[PDB]
Design a protein around this ligand. Sequence first.
Ligand SMILES: [Ca+2]
Ligand SMILES: [Ca+2]
Ligand SMILES: [Ca+2]
Ligand SMILES: [Ca+2]
Ligand SMILES: [Ca+2]
Ligand code: NA
Length: 320
Amino acid sequence: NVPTFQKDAYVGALRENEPSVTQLVRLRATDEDQITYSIVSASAFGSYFDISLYEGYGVISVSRPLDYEQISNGLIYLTVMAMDAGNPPLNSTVPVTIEVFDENDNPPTFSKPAYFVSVVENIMAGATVLFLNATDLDRSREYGQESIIYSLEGSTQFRINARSGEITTTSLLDRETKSEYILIVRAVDGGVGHNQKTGIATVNITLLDINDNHPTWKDAPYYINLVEMTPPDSDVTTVVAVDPDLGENGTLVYSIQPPNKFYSLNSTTGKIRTTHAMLDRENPDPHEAELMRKIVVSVTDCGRPPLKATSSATVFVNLL
Ligand SMILES: [Ca+2]
Ligand SMILES: [Ca+2]
Ligand SMILES: [Ca+2]
Ligand SMILES: [Ca+2]
Ligand SMILES: [Ca+2]
Ligand code: NA
Protein backbone atom coordinates (compact mmCIF):
# COMPACT_ATOMS: atom_id res chain seq x y z
CA ASN A 1 0.00 0.00 0.00
CA VAL A 2 2.41 2.78 1.30
CA PRO A 3 6.11 2.51 0.25
CA THR A 4 7.90 1.28 3.37
CA PHE A 5 11.66 1.38 3.64
CA GLN A 6 13.32 -1.83 4.74
CA LYS A 7 15.03 0.02 7.60
CA ASP A 8 14.05 2.58 10.24
CA ALA A 9 17.14 4.63 9.27
CA TYR A 10 20.17 4.61 6.92
CA VAL A 11 23.86 5.62 7.09
CA GLY A 12 26.90 6.40 4.90
CA ALA A 13 30.37 7.76 5.52
CA LEU A 14 33.39 9.27 3.79
CA ARG A 15 36.48 11.42 4.32
CA GLU A 16 36.52 15.09 3.50
CA ASN A 17 38.26 16.10 0.25
CA GLU A 18 37.14 12.97 -1.73
CA PRO A 19 36.67 13.67 -5.47
CA SER A 20 33.27 11.84 -5.69
CA VAL A 21 31.64 8.78 -4.03
CA THR A 22 29.44 6.42 -5.98
CA GLN A 23 27.52 4.71 -3.13
CA LEU A 24 27.23 6.43 0.20
CA VAL A 25 23.96 4.67 0.79
CA ARG A 26 21.65 2.13 -0.80
CA LEU A 27 17.95 2.25 0.10
CA ARG A 28 14.87 0.37 -0.94
CA ALA A 29 11.19 0.67 -0.10
CA THR A 30 8.45 -1.75 -1.23
CA ASP A 31 4.75 -1.51 -2.27
CA GLU A 32 2.47 -4.59 -2.26
CA ASP A 33 0.51 -3.05 -5.23
CA GLN A 34 6.53 2.01 -9.26
CA ILE A 35 8.80 3.66 -6.67
CA THR A 36 10.68 6.94 -7.03
CA TYR A 37 13.28 8.12 -4.50
CA SER A 38 14.10 11.77 -3.74
CA ILE A 39 16.27 13.75 -1.33
CA VAL A 40 13.86 16.04 0.38
CA SER A 41 16.13 17.58 3.04
CA ALA A 42 19.79 18.14 3.76
CA SER A 43 21.44 19.68 6.83
CA ALA A 44 24.12 21.13 4.49
CA PHE A 45 25.59 20.97 0.96
CA GLY A 46 22.45 19.50 -0.53
CA SER A 47 23.67 20.42 -4.03
CA TYR A 48 26.58 17.99 -3.60
CA PHE A 49 24.30 14.94 -3.15
CA ASP A 50 22.35 13.02 -5.75
CA ILE A 51 20.09 9.97 -5.75
CA SER A 52 19.56 7.54 -8.60
CA LEU A 53 17.62 4.31 -9.21
CA TYR A 54 20.09 1.45 -9.73
CA GLU A 55 19.05 -2.24 -9.76
CA GLY A 56 15.87 -1.59 -7.71
CA TYR A 57 17.71 0.43 -5.04
CA GLY A 58 17.68 4.15 -4.45
CA VAL A 59 21.38 4.95 -4.32
CA ILE A 60 22.81 8.10 -2.84
CA SER A 61 26.05 9.53 -4.19
CA VAL A 62 28.10 12.67 -3.68
CA SER A 63 29.76 14.43 -6.62
CA ARG A 64 32.03 17.08 -5.05
CA PRO A 65 34.47 16.89 -2.19
CA LEU A 66 33.28 18.07 1.20
CA ASP A 67 35.09 20.21 3.75
CA TYR A 68 34.98 18.88 7.32
CA GLU A 69 35.80 22.36 8.56
CA GLN A 70 32.55 23.73 7.05
CA ILE A 71 30.30 21.12 8.74
CA SER A 72 29.07 21.15 12.33
CA ASN A 73 29.74 17.95 14.23
CA GLY A 74 30.95 15.83 11.28
CA LEU A 75 27.39 14.97 10.29
CA ILE A 76 25.08 15.69 7.45
CA TYR A 77 21.46 14.68 7.86
CA LEU A 78 19.36 13.91 4.84
CA THR A 79 15.77 12.85 4.48
CA VAL A 80 14.88 10.47 1.64
CA MET A 81 11.36 9.97 0.30
CA ALA A 82 9.98 6.97 -1.55
CA MET A 83 6.85 7.64 -3.56
CA ASP A 84 4.73 5.31 -5.71
CA ALA A 85 3.06 6.08 -9.05
CA GLY A 86 -0.27 6.51 -7.27
CA ASN A 87 -3.01 9.07 -7.92
CA PRO A 88 -2.84 10.59 -5.39
CA PRO A 89 0.69 9.31 -4.71
CA LEU A 90 1.72 7.76 -1.42
CA ASN A 91 5.05 8.38 0.25
CA SER A 92 7.20 7.58 3.22
CA THR A 93 10.39 9.30 4.47
CA VAL A 94 13.46 8.05 6.29
CA PRO A 95 16.50 9.64 7.92
CA VAL A 96 19.90 9.19 6.42
CA THR A 97 23.03 10.17 8.28
CA ILE A 98 26.25 10.97 6.47
CA GLU A 99 29.33 10.95 8.66
CA VAL A 100 32.22 13.00 7.29
CA PHE A 101 35.66 12.13 8.65
CA ASP A 102 38.20 14.87 9.29
CA GLU A 103 41.46 14.86 7.36
CA ASN A 104 44.41 16.75 8.77
CA ASP A 105 44.39 19.41 6.06
CA ASN A 106 45.35 22.45 8.18
CA PRO A 107 48.68 23.33 9.77
CA PRO A 108 49.33 25.03 13.13
CA THR A 109 50.20 28.70 12.61
CA PHE A 110 51.41 31.65 14.60
CA SER A 111 50.35 35.25 14.41
CA LYS A 112 53.95 36.22 13.73
CA PRO A 113 57.06 34.44 12.42
CA ALA A 114 59.19 36.17 15.08
CA TYR A 115 58.37 37.49 18.50
CA PHE A 116 60.43 39.95 20.48
CA VAL A 117 60.43 40.22 24.27
CA SER A 118 62.48 42.15 26.80
CA VAL A 119 62.97 41.11 30.39
CA VAL A 120 64.89 42.32 33.43
CA GLU A 121 67.92 40.08 34.13
CA ASN A 122 66.85 39.30 37.74
CA ILE A 123 63.71 37.50 36.62
CA MET A 124 62.37 35.03 39.21
CA ALA A 125 63.29 31.51 38.04
CA GLY A 126 60.03 30.10 36.60
CA ALA A 127 58.18 33.35 35.77
CA THR A 128 56.11 34.14 32.70
CA VAL A 129 58.47 35.12 29.89
CA LEU A 130 55.76 34.98 27.14
CA PHE A 131 52.33 33.53 26.29
CA LEU A 132 52.28 31.90 22.82
CA ASN A 133 49.28 30.86 20.86
CA ALA A 134 49.22 28.73 17.75
CA THR A 135 46.05 28.21 15.78
CA ASP A 136 45.16 25.02 13.94
CA LEU A 137 42.01 25.32 11.86
CA ASP A 138 41.03 21.65 11.52
CA ARG A 139 37.66 21.29 13.19
CA SER A 140 38.13 17.89 14.91
CA ARG A 141 39.87 17.69 18.29
CA GLU A 142 42.21 15.02 16.89
CA TYR A 143 43.69 17.19 14.12
CA GLY A 144 42.82 20.78 15.09
CA GLN A 145 43.23 23.18 18.00
CA GLU A 146 42.99 20.67 20.89
CA SER A 147 45.83 18.55 19.41
CA ILE A 148 48.58 21.18 19.46
CA ILE A 149 51.82 20.35 21.28
CA TYR A 150 54.34 23.14 21.80
CA SER A 151 58.07 22.44 21.76
CA LEU A 152 61.07 24.76 22.31
CA GLU A 153 64.70 24.70 21.08
CA GLY A 154 67.65 26.92 22.03
CA SER A 155 68.78 27.37 25.64
CA THR A 156 68.26 24.97 28.54
CA GLN A 157 67.58 28.12 30.58
CA PHE A 158 64.12 28.31 29.05
CA ARG A 159 61.25 25.89 28.70
CA ILE A 160 57.76 25.91 27.24
CA ASN A 161 54.53 24.48 28.55
CA ALA A 162 53.57 21.81 26.03
CA ARG A 163 49.77 22.36 26.10
CA SER A 164 49.38 26.17 26.73
CA GLY A 165 52.56 27.49 25.08
CA GLU A 166 53.49 29.64 28.11
CA ILE A 167 57.30 30.11 28.13
CA THR A 168 59.18 30.09 31.38
CA THR A 169 62.64 30.24 32.92
CA THR A 170 64.77 27.35 34.21
CA SER A 171 66.98 29.63 36.33
CA LEU A 172 68.31 33.03 37.33
CA LEU A 173 69.74 34.85 34.33
CA ASP A 174 72.75 37.09 33.88
CA ARG A 175 73.01 39.95 31.35
CA GLU A 176 76.73 40.16 32.13
CA THR A 177 77.36 36.73 30.46
CA LYS A 178 74.38 36.17 28.17
CA SER A 179 72.70 39.28 26.85
CA GLU A 180 70.36 37.79 24.20
CA TYR A 181 68.73 34.51 23.05
CA ILE A 182 67.11 33.22 19.86
CA LEU A 183 64.72 30.34 20.51
CA ILE A 184 62.68 28.23 18.11
CA VAL A 185 59.11 27.29 18.92
CA ARG A 186 57.40 24.38 17.22
CA ALA A 187 53.64 23.78 17.40
CA VAL A 188 52.57 20.33 16.06
CA ASP A 189 49.13 18.81 15.46
CA GLY A 190 47.73 15.33 15.98
CA GLY A 191 48.47 14.11 12.45
CA VAL A 192 50.58 10.93 12.36
CA GLY A 193 53.77 10.36 10.41
CA HIS A 194 54.03 12.47 7.25
CA ASN A 195 50.54 13.97 7.82
CA GLN A 196 51.58 15.60 11.06
CA LYS A 197 51.95 19.33 10.42
CA THR A 198 53.99 21.86 12.23
CA GLY A 199 54.12 25.64 12.83
CA ILE A 200 57.28 27.57 13.66
CA ALA A 201 58.30 30.90 15.16
CA THR A 202 61.42 32.44 16.58
CA VAL A 203 61.41 34.18 19.97
CA ASN A 204 64.12 36.73 20.44
CA ILE A 205 64.82 37.63 24.06
CA THR A 206 66.75 40.64 25.34
CA LEU A 207 67.91 41.05 28.93
CA LEU A 208 67.46 44.51 30.47
CA ASP A 209 70.19 45.58 32.88
CA ILE A 210 69.90 45.73 36.64
CA ASN A 211 72.51 47.39 38.80
CA ASP A 212 73.53 43.96 40.17
CA ASN A 213 77.35 44.43 40.25
CA HIS A 214 79.69 46.35 42.54
CA PRO A 215 82.69 48.19 41.23
CA THR A 216 85.86 46.18 41.92
CA TRP A 217 89.51 47.29 41.81
CA LYS A 218 91.85 46.37 38.96
CA ASP A 219 95.53 45.92 40.05
CA ALA A 220 95.15 47.17 43.63
CA PRO A 221 96.89 47.84 45.86
CA TYR A 222 98.92 50.24 43.68
CA TYR A 223 102.64 50.96 44.13
CA ILE A 224 104.11 54.18 42.70
CA ASN A 225 107.57 55.79 43.04
CA LEU A 226 107.44 59.58 43.07
CA VAL A 227 110.21 62.17 43.47
CA GLU A 228 110.43 64.52 46.54
CA MET A 229 109.27 68.17 46.12
CA THR A 230 107.64 67.51 42.72
CA PRO A 231 105.71 70.54 41.33
CA PRO A 232 101.99 71.15 41.75
CA ASP A 233 99.80 69.45 39.08
CA SER A 234 102.44 66.73 38.29
CA ASP A 235 100.85 63.44 37.24
CA VAL A 236 101.02 60.76 39.98
CA THR A 237 99.18 57.59 38.90
CA THR A 238 95.82 56.38 37.64
CA VAL A 239 93.43 54.23 39.67
CA VAL A 240 90.85 51.91 38.14
CA ALA A 241 87.79 49.95 39.14
CA VAL A 242 85.42 47.95 36.86
CA ASP A 243 81.66 47.69 36.79
CA PRO A 244 80.32 45.49 34.03
CA ASP A 245 76.70 46.78 34.36
CA LEU A 246 75.43 49.22 31.63
CA GLY A 247 75.13 53.02 31.32
CA GLU A 248 74.70 54.69 34.72
CA ASN A 249 75.00 51.36 36.59
CA GLY A 250 78.49 50.79 35.21
CA THR A 251 79.65 54.44 35.41
CA LEU A 252 82.39 54.95 38.02
CA VAL A 253 82.94 57.84 40.45
CA TYR A 254 86.25 57.95 42.30
CA SER A 255 87.02 60.00 45.39
CA ILE A 256 89.68 60.26 48.10
CA GLN A 257 88.29 59.32 51.49
CA PRO A 258 89.26 60.53 53.95
CA PRO A 259 90.57 63.77 52.25
CA ASN A 260 94.31 64.15 51.45
CA LYS A 261 95.74 67.66 50.90
CA PHE A 262 98.87 66.44 48.99
CA TYR A 263 96.87 64.78 46.20
CA SER A 264 93.76 65.34 44.08
CA LEU A 265 92.05 62.95 41.64
CA ASN A 266 89.71 63.31 38.73
CA SER A 267 86.45 61.67 39.86
CA THR A 268 85.56 60.55 36.31
CA THR A 269 89.10 59.33 35.28
CA GLY A 270 90.84 58.30 38.52
CA LYS A 271 93.93 60.25 37.43
CA ILE A 272 95.80 61.48 40.54
CA ARG A 273 97.92 64.65 40.37
CA THR A 274 99.79 66.62 43.05
CA THR A 275 98.52 69.71 44.80
CA HIS A 276 100.15 73.03 45.71
CA ALA A 277 100.92 71.29 49.08
CA MET A 278 104.60 70.39 48.60
CA LEU A 279 106.13 67.01 49.29
CA ASP A 280 109.06 67.33 51.74
CA ARG A 281 110.45 63.78 52.18
CA GLU A 282 112.01 64.74 55.57
CA ASN A 283 108.88 66.53 56.94
CA PRO A 284 108.49 66.74 60.76
CA ASP A 285 104.72 66.09 61.14
CA PRO A 286 103.94 62.31 61.65
CA HIS A 287 100.30 62.33 60.38
CA GLU A 288 101.08 64.77 57.54
CA ALA A 289 104.07 62.65 56.39
CA GLU A 290 102.11 59.36 56.46
CA LEU A 291 99.46 60.62 53.99
CA MET A 292 102.23 62.21 51.92
CA ARG A 293 103.04 58.60 51.07
CA LYS A 294 99.64 56.84 51.28
CA ILE A 295 96.36 57.62 49.50
CA VAL A 296 93.15 55.71 50.21
CA VAL A 297 90.54 55.82 47.48
CA SER A 298 86.90 54.71 47.30
CA VAL A 299 84.68 54.13 44.24
CA THR A 300 80.91 54.12 43.61
CA ASP A 301 78.79 53.59 40.49
CA CYS A 302 75.87 55.88 39.50
CA GLY A 303 73.01 53.45 40.07
CA ARG A 304 69.82 53.98 42.06
CA PRO A 305 70.61 53.01 44.68
CA PRO A 306 74.29 53.55 43.76
CA LEU A 307 76.52 50.60 44.72
CA LYS A 308 80.17 50.94 45.66
CA ALA A 309 83.22 48.71 46.00
CA THR A 310 83.47 46.55 49.09
CA SER A 311 87.01 47.65 49.93
CA SER A 312 88.77 50.88 49.40
CA ALA A 313 92.09 50.67 47.60
CA THR A 314 95.49 52.06 48.41
CA VAL A 315 98.20 53.86 46.52
CA PHE A 316 101.44 53.21 48.40
CA VAL A 317 103.77 56.09 47.47
CA ASN A 318 107.53 55.88 47.89
CA LEU A 319 109.29 59.26 48.03
CA LEU A 320 112.74 60.06 46.53
CA1 LIG B 1 38.99 20.65 4.93
CA1 LIG C 1 40.37 18.85 8.25
CA1 LIG D 1 45.73 20.21 11.83
CA1 LIG E 1 76.94 48.46 39.08
CA1 LIG F 1 73.69 44.06 35.35
NA1 NA G 1 73.77 39.71 36.33
